[PDB]
Amino acid sequence: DLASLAIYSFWIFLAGLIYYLQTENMREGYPLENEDGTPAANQGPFPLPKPKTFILPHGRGTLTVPGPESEDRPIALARTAVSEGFPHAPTGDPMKDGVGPASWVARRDLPELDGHGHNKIKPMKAAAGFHVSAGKNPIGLPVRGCDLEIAGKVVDIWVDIPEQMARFLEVELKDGSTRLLPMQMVKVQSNRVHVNALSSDLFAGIPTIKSPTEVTLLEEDKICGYVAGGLMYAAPKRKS
Amino acid sequence: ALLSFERKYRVPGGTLVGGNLFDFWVGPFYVGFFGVATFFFAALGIILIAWSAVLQGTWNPQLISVYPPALEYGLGGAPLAKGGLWQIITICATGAFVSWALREVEICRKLGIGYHIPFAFAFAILAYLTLVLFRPVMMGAWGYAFPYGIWTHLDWVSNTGYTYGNFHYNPAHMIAISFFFTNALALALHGALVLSAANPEKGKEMRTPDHEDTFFRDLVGYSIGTLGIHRLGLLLSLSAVFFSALCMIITGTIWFDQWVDWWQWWVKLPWWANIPGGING
Amino acid sequence: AEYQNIFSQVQVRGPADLGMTEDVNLANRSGVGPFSTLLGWFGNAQLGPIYLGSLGVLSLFSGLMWFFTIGIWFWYQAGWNPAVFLRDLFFFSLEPPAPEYGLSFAAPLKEGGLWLIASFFMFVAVWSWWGRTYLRAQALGMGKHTAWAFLSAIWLWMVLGFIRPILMGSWSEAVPYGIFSHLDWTNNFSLVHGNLFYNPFHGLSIAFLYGSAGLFAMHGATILAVSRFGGERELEQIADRGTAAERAALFWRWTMGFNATMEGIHRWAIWMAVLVTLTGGIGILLSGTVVDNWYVWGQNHG
């Protein structure tokens, strides 16, 4: 009957839908590789889809995927075993080298832009009309790391203009330079901002931005990666 | 085999138990101590289900069914073939699910991400436990739990529901359903919105999140925003499960009559109880 | 302890955002509403503007009239007594014509006619709201994913109120307008068709419904977990994959052995959700038209 036909057709549709969905989700990261960067022998049963091209706004070009994959940066790790599937040890200081949970991707070294082509994120001092509208204003608070020592002080908030939200705290260190801290990695308290991921001595090693009133996607990745990496790599200097 | 970008993240560390002893992968899968624990609990549980099938006399996946002890056993143990297997399989399931969650926690730690995913999963675990552990214990017997079979668990859902009349009238169930439906509505809208911006009309440039906010303001006068919508899907999905668990935990324990009758507390409030007219006068 | 990014710690506000212009007729946007600090702990604080063209006004007027037609029936059933109106609010019901009227428009106001009027208004409200989801996307140069998704919901609604009654040859088959009565209708529908648990389209619909909650819990949780690297800026992660997108992928690859992309997760999402009402509408449409009893149908596989 008709119900039998409908249910049989539906499962055929669903198998086709799943094939389409899985292949769409292979537009990044594939083909799979061995640990040494060469193509793996076993790619599995789904082939790569035909490329699509996204047209990016404001003259930034296009992206075509899938396309040739590469890291575009050195990776300071080495095998710890003679066969596949074991961890790779940092060959230096993993925080400075940007590996493990301190990792960063070689994103475009330009700022993300809003829909009018202005910088998406700006220090609040240069964002006209923007101010703190609720909650404890962090500006002026001392900033404490997980060693319980003061690492610096908050001198601004960087804000997402189109979405109206706090993205980073700008923190000045003892030497008078500043660093960005991801808003999602600080706790604003009544008398301080507390940063569990980093001990005070690691603040200076947070990657710097090249221009003081904008941050490029590359730089946001280095900064956020470095701070998150501290949860694993500053664990010896943390504490209670 | 590794995704093209994967190697830099495969460093040592993050384990909760065992240091480096189980810090490795098998293909794509991370192991860890809790991966070993998962494999053990799951393997045992699956073996025991296969045995329960031999004892039941079938291999058809649509008939295999492991039933908990009948009610006469209360909270005691029961022979294997008469509820005991269920009891052990359930311990194994709990073991495997909790172990899955803790293994997710290890993966979070190695990757330097938040713990939100295992936290969310724990809500599914708590719903499962409400049905097989908490509610049975409070009601005084394992036999109030559901059986492990594809169609038999549906018989349990139907029989349990209609024990209280039309189960639609359980008010915590109404709230639960509201969250499930709202969740799906939000999921449809979120997926469509992102895709409608990433994949604009032919030859146009990708839209921005400013356009996604704009689309929603234009449509309904409000846009929750890109951070908000992810908060929202999380809240709606977890609230739906919270209220599911709640609607069951109260049923057969604090309320055990027909759910339709619970609503009489509103109808009978003194100020309008006796006014003639309407449906209830 | 560690901040979790469920609620914001600090709100910021700037000039009201009037939005992108693209091909939109600006004469038709309102001005901004108030700002809600309350909302702003969780999402955006800003309310409005909204767009209100001719279609918008039609949809709103029609929808209001649907709602008021029902409410006026409720006041009548209440004997115009406010106390009875509130006491019995969930028990009132505006019911479709009896089966003897078939698909005719001939039933008196009190015994079906008013249900039809309320329904006509709903039909206009929803379909003009649909045209609006298409047109607001079009004016901004956006894909039509929202209107396509909304159409899957419309399908179940249309089946329940309009297509299934038409094929069964009577309006008495349609859902009544009331809180409790629509639940009674739903229970009854299942009993009358031999228990919907045996309808395979209903089981699929459930699997997608539960699947939607699983996936949004997974996906919402995942984005929040990588929000420390800008994860929720999904369109730019699509355009230019960052460490947020990579860590998210790998969480899942390591956990369950495969993973999505930042764009493709949204394709898993839209389909998981639309398959709920898609499968659902099919299931309901077949009930009584082609299959009188799902237990019986299931015994015959076909």
Ligand code: BCL
């Ligand atoms: C799927 C099979 C059944 C069905 C079975 C059930 C079951 C079972 C339950 C509901 C529940 C609901 N159903 Mg129903 N319901 C059906 C089809 C519908 C249709 C329709 C087709 O137009 C509507 C409008 C509703 C509406 C409703 C709401 C009263 C409620 C929560 C819905 C929600 O969260 O969704 C989306 C969420 C949104 C936020 C968008 C919509 C917002 C509002 C709430 C909808 C307006 C409805 C009405 C005008 C409100 C009047 C309130 C006062 C009288 C003023 N149902 C079909 C016929 N429905 C739950 C409930 O609590 O009932 C008491 C419940 O447990």
Ligand code: BCL
């Ligand atoms: C005749 C039946 C009654 C009725 C009787 C009941 C009964 C009885 C129950 C419900 C419950 C529910 N009802 Mg009801 N309900 C009715 C009608 C409805 C209608 C409707 C439109 O009419 C709707 C929408 C609902 C919706 C709901 C939900 C609130 C809830 C189910 C989800 C849940 O608990 O998730 C929770 C999620 C889980 C339990 C899954 C847990 C997963 C675990 C952690 C992991 C599994 C791993 C797996 C084994 C791995 C395999 C390995 C492979 C690699 C994949 N009901 C009718 C009136 N309803 C249930 C509820 O609240 O339960 C708490 C419940 O018990």
Ligand code: BCL
């Ligand atoms: C939640 C409230 C009720 C319940 C009420 C219903 C109702 C009503 C329906 C189902 C249906 C299903 N239920 Mg149930 N179900 C319950 C609890 C469970 C549990 C559990 C471990 O707690 C499991 C594993 C299942 C599993 C199932 C599937 C067989 C089916 C589709 C689910 C789905 O797609 O979800 C979403 C999926 C995910 C989030 C991931 C997908 C997981 C896969 C599909 C699960 C396969 C599990 C496998 C068969 C178990 C074998 C274990 C082996 C030893 C490995 N239910 C409780 C008792 N369930 C539907 C059906 O068609 O039944 C025949 C149906 O109509």
Ligand code: BCL
């Ligand atoms: C005793 C009850 C019966 C039962 C009888 C039914 C009946 C009858 C139906 C379902 C349907 C469903 N059942 Mg059932 N079902 C039972 C038990 C269950 C159980 C369980 C036991 O755990 C579960 C989990 C479910 C789950 C489900 C859902 C998967 C499915 C509805 C999906 C949906 O999103 O609809 C909600 C979405 C909509 C209704 C779309 C509405 C869209 C329109 C366009 C919105 C208009 C809004 C309006 C204008 C108001 C605006 C107000 C605003 C504020 C502006 N059922 C038992 C066996 N079930 C439905 C289905 O598809 O079955 C296959 C259905 O018709």
Ligand SMILES: CC[C@H]1c2cc3[nH]c4c(c3C)C(=O)[C@H](C(=O)OC)c4c3nc(cc4[nH]c(cc(n2)[C@@H]1C)c(C(C)=O)c4C)[C@@H](C)[C@@H]3CCC(=O)OC/C=C(\C)CCC[C@H](C)CCC[C@H](C)CCCC(C)C
């Ligand atoms: C894929 C399936 C899921 C789905 C998807 C979905 N729904 C959608 C869409 C999509 C993709 C939309 O694009 C569309 C939308 O605009 O979303 C914001 C919509 C929508 N889904 C809606 C509801 C809805 N969806 C539901 C379900 C689902 N939607 C499924 C789970 C349900 C359930 C679960 O029952 C409901 C109730 C609406 C919010 C919206 C469609 C809006 C619409 O059609 O409006 C017509 C009506 C009006 C314009 C006005 C109605 C009048 C009000 C009732 C007035 C009440 C208040 C008033 C202030 C009272 C005044 C009285 C005083 C005088 C005292």
Ligand SMILES: CC[C@H]1c2cc3[nH]c4c(c3C)C(=O)[C@H](C(=O)OC)c4c3nc(cc4[nH]c(cc(n2)[C@@H]1C)c(C(C)=O)c4C)[C@@H](C)[C@@H]3CCC(=O)OC/C=C(\C)CCC[C@H](C)CCC[C@H](C)CCCC(C)C
């Ligand atoms: C809390 C919100 C929703 C949700 C969230 C959620 N689920 C999740 C997660 C999250 C955040 C994960 O991180 C985790 C995951 O890895 O997904 C890919 C998961 C998951 N949710 C799953 C299933 C699932 N979730 C469900 C529901 C939900 N999950 C909620 C609606 C359901 C329903 C609704 O029925 C099911 C079936 C799994 C795919 C996965 C967890 C996998 C896991 O724990 O692996 C370890 C265990 C095994 C590999 C096998 C154990 C075998 C047992 C020992 C024996 C079988 C006993 C069982 C009781 C038989 C019952 C069968 C019958 C009922 C038919």
Ligand SMILES: COC(C)(C)C/C=C/C(C)=C/C=C/C(C)=C/C=C/C(C)=C/C=C\C=C(C)\C=C\C=C(/C)CC/C=C(\C)CCC=C(C)C
């Ligand atoms: C406070 O008092 C006032 C007066 C101010 C207002 C109060 C109002 C109240 C209390 C309103 C309450 C409304 C309620 C409770 C509404 C509940 C609605 C529900 C639960 C609806 C559920 C399902 C409805 C469905 C499936 C409807 C489907 C309808 C269609 C598909 C439309 C079909 C169109 C038809 C039949 C018309 C065809 C006509 C022509 C001419 C072709």
Ligand SMILES: CCCCCCCCCCCC[N+](C)(C)[O-]
């Ligand atoms: C049996 C096969 C049916 C399942 C196919 C589902 C694909 C739906 C998506 C349509 C998008 C088409 N595309 C790639 C040209 O954009």
Ligand SMILES: CCCCCCCCCCCC[N+](C)(C)[O-]
């Ligand atoms: C319905 C549940 C989700 C559908 C399952 C699709 C799983 C695809 C597995 C892809 C294998 C990927 N890889 C890279 C390991 O080859």
Ligand SMILES: CCCCCCCCCCCC[N+](C)(C)[O-]
């Ligand atoms: C004493 C606790 C009472 C809580 C029960 C209320 C359940 C209502 C369900 C939510 C939908 C509300 N509604 C009908 C206005 O749409």
Ligand SMILES: CCCCCCCCCCCC[N+](C)(C)[O-]
């Ligand atoms: C924008 C999301 C709208 C949230 C409302 C969803 C319907 C839930 C039903 C009533 C919720 C009752 N609760 C939990 C607040 O007590």
Ligand SMILES: CCCCCCCCCCCC[N+](C)(C)[O-]
């Ligand atoms: C009769 C109801 C049918 C509605 C089904 C429409 C599915 C829409 C889901 C999005 C797919 C659209 N697109 C353009 C990506 O192909």
Ligand SMILES: [Fe+3]
């Ligand atoms: Fe998303």
Ligand SMILES: [K+]
């Ligand atoms: K400023």
